[PDB]
Amino acid sequence: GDVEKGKKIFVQKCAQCHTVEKGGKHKTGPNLHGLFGRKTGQAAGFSYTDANQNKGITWGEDTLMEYLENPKKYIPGTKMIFAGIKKKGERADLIAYLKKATNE
Ligand code: HEC
């Protein structure tokens, strides 16, 4: 994936609901710092659905690749109202961006 392309995707498709930085605010969706290795539904201070709390997976490259294609298919009942990113390359770029931005 291409980090710079992924940054642009994040701004267009994600940033209205999510921050990535350490100490960034929860918004409509949870702050995503530490995403890689985070268990579903475990960010303190965010009110998740039971569906997101109970999915029982660890976020990382492949679980994110699947989720982001079609969130509701991966986590039925999620309150993340986002249809998905259909192009594999776009998902890969976004994930590469997230891997950097959620760790910095
Ligand atoms: C607002 C309209 C959203 C947009 C646009 C995106 N996300 Fe989101 N996300 C949102 C909510 C309300 C939640 C919680 C859902 C629930 O059912 O409780 C989420 C959740 C995620 C998660 C899971 C995080 C966890 O701690 O388990 C991830 C990884 C995530 N969102 C990522 C993400 C990305 C990368 C987006 C752009 C493609 C994106 N979301 C858009 C709300 C909104």
Numbering used by the authors: 1 to 104
The authors write:
Cytochrome c (Cytc) is a globular 104 amino acid heme protein that orchestrates cellular life and death decisions. It functions as an electron carrier in the electron transport chain (ETC) and as a trigger of apoptosis when released from the mitochondria. Cytc transfers single electrons from complex III (bc1 complex) to complex IV (cytochrome c oxidase, COX) where oxygen is reduced to water in the ETC. Cytc also acts as a signaling molecule for apoptosis upon release from the mitochondria, by interacting with apoptosis protease activating factor-1 (Apaf-1) and forming an active apoptosome, which initiates caspase-9 activity and the downstream caspase cascade.
Our data show that Cytc is acetylated on lysine 53 in both androgen hormone-resistant and -sensitive human prostate cancer xenografts. As the cost to grow enough xenografts to obtain preparative amounts of Cytc for functional studies is prohibitive, we replaced the lysine residue with glutamine, which mimics acetylated lysine. This mutation (K53Q) converts the positive charge of the lysine side chain to a neutral charge, similar to the effect of lysine acetylation seen with the acetylated protein in vivo. Only the K53Q acetylmimetic mutant crystallized and gave a high-resolution structure at 1.31 Å in space group P21212 with two independent monomers in the asymmetric unit. The electron density for Q53 in molecule B is better defined because its side chain is immobilized by a hydrogen bond to the carbonyl oxygen of Y40. The side chain of Q53 in molecule A interacts only with a water molecule within 3.5 Å. Of the new mutants studied here only the K53Q Cytc mutant crystallized and gave a high-resolution structure at 1.31 Å that showed good omit map density for Q53 and confirmed that the mutation caused no major structural disturbance or unfolding at its location, although there is a moderate distortion at R38-Q42 due to crystal packing. Interestingly, molecular dynamics simulations revealed that K53Q has increased flexibility at the T28 epitope, a loop previously shown to be an important regulatory domain. We propose that the increased mobility of this loop may explain the increased ROS scavenging activities of acetylmimetic Cytc due to a more flexible and thus open structure, allowing easier access of superoxide and H2O2 to the heme group. The experimental results showed that acetylmimetic K53Q and K53I Cytc resulted in a lower oxygen consumption rate compared to WT and K53R Cytc. Interestingly, acetylmimetic K53Q and nonpolar K53I resulted in significantly 80% and 87% reduced caspase-3 activity, compared to the WT.
